[PDB]
Amino acid sequence: DMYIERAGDITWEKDAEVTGNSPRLDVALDESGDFSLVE
Amino acid sequence: TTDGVYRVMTRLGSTQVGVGVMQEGVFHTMWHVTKGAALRSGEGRLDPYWGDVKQDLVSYCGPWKLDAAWDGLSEVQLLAVPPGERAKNIQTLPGIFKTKDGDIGAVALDYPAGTSGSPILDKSGRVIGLYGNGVVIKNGSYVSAITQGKR
């Protein structure tokens, strides 16, 4: 019941919206693909 | 078949569960979007070919093709495809998931869950990873790994 629909080209856009922090975090990745913070 | 970014929909009513990347005739998304189910593409059927739950990635019709990686310095662009919204580029400078197996770029952007699988791009337009597997740091501040596979 799953289908796909084209949404756009894979292109860099000159002068795009710029947002978001850049945190540095210690993490562990378990067998289930779950990231978790570590200290 | 044609290269591009795609919505991943499911069928009453149609919902967007994810996003993926078509490249070199292979469709790439994250495992938790499709759980490896077959995808319909027009009259055609895309069958899962490679998948890994730990990486949370899956490729259809062939092996994983995307191999570009974050340079650790430059801003990137999340090519977000939110449900009901046209594709839009969000520029950001990645933070870093530091793991015992090395550093993985990460983007502190919080888009609806149907945006999982959206490609993250470098300045040449190469897909350096997919959006939507990550961690929360404090009160829903979601940060997504830049998840990339092996070619």
Swiss-Prot record, chain B:
Top-level taxon of origin: Viruses
Coiled-coil region: none
Subcellular location: Host cytoplasm; Host endoplasmic reticulum membrane
Post-translational modifications reported in the UniProt record: Acetylated by host KAT5. Acetylation modulates NS3 RNA-binding and unwinding activities and plays an important positive role for viral replication.
Membrane topology (UniProt): Peripheral membrane protein
Residues covered by the Peptidase S7 domain: 1-151
Protein's recorded name: Serine protease NS3
Taxonomic source organism: Zika virus
